[PDB]
Amino acid sequence: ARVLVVDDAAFMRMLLKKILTQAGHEVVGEASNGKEAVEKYKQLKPDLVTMDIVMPEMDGITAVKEIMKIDPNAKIIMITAVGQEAKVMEALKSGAKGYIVKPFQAQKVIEEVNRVL
Template sequence: MTGMRLLPEGDTEVEMAKVMVAEQYDSIRYLLRTVLTSVGHEVVVEVNNGPDVLSTFHSTLPDIVSLDLRLPSMDGFELMKHIKSTSPNTRIIAYSSGIHAVDVEMAISCGASVAFDKPFDLDDYLKHFQ
């Protein structure tokens, strides 16, 4: 992680992270970028499909990947395996609409720190970036 930031409500410090937002929908990418940057994280790249995750990951080297498991053109589980095989310390926050318990288990086994259903509460989402 790249730096420290004081939270406005107190003296608790959180590490700022370089984040890749991998989400197929423009409006959700915009929302996630806005929320993440508002709390001090740096969104280093936004992508809307699996091949773009792979083509930009190594040049941006994010600390955290916010990953929609159902990106076009590539399976999210395979993307996680690739990310973790080349960069084991990268944290992956995985989500998808209509996610089931088996998907959560598979996401964790492929390297996600957490996996949850979309839509999600933004405050809960942000907790995974601390």
């Protein structure tokens, strides 16, 4: 069978891939999160999917909060896309120190890195 292997841990995808291949199956693709598994399913139409039941769920804001609990002096720069300004605002409130804009202009990224350090 043609198998899509889904797990956030690269090494776990590799272990499962080895077992599946030894049993005669072909791993036709891999994914590390939910959204990616859906897209790869559409594209590859595998006979079978294996999926870790823990898929990454933690949003940027929560990650900022957790890092700030571990280290109140942490320095975090957010990357924004357009339309997510509300979330960046909240990330800054929760302790992030700045942000940079995609697509990256190298000079502006570096200027912001220097300001934050």
